[PDB]
Write a protein that binds this DNA or RNA. Sequence first.
RNA 1: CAUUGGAGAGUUUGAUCCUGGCUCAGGACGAACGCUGGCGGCGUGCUUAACACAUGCAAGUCGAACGGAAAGGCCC
Length: 179
Amino acid sequence: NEYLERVVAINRVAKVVQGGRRFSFTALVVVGDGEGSVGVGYGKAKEVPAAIAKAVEEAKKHFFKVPLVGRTITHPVIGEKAAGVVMLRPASPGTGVIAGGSARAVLECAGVHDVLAKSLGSSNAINVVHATVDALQQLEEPEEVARRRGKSVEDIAPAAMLRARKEADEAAAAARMEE
RNA sequence: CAUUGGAGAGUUUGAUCCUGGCUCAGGACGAACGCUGGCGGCGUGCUUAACACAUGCAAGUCGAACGGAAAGGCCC
Ligand SMILES: [Mg+2]
Ligand SMILES: [Mg+2]
Ligand SMILES: [Mg+2]
């Protein structure tokens, strides 16, 4: 539909009571637009559909923009929440999302189409997802880098990156008109 | 004054997170084995006993260095 989502992982958690165990289901969802806004939602329920829906509606209110320099990451980053380290590097067009399941789902929902992502540290899906999330949040878009440094993009950033951004904008124009 | 390049999964708990080993998906081979087997092209083929070897062959050539004449060859 309008917003593209992947179910990263589901788990069957339980609570022990005098009678026995009270099982429950946890859901990781990643919901994105495919063009730069993406979020992750955690859902608790007694049932898989309810947990998934709760996670999705909780993720809707956690959409953060991701800077894409033409279908790829702006610059290499390394994120880490708790113990989930995720390394991201931009890749040439056509490389694809070379990433592990959870991080790959996060990137595909964010709309990145050429990226190299490695999962260092723990392999727990939730923590790896948070590490991919803050790795993406660490991304620093070239115009705001120029604002930070009090300079211009032509003075701070690589000419190849800027050029590739122009050609990507031109294919954007193409699609738009074509429509 | 950009890059040609990096994927995980299972398993400790009632459940969780971490640590952590174990196991697996890939590629490879001077390989062997099992089942099966049409052809062609190009390679490769004792990794162990530097263990012991029947048989044939694998280093000869020169008469324009020499005496020669055992064969073939010409002349009697
Ligand atoms: Mg650490
Ligand atoms: Mg224990
Ligand atoms: Mg168990």
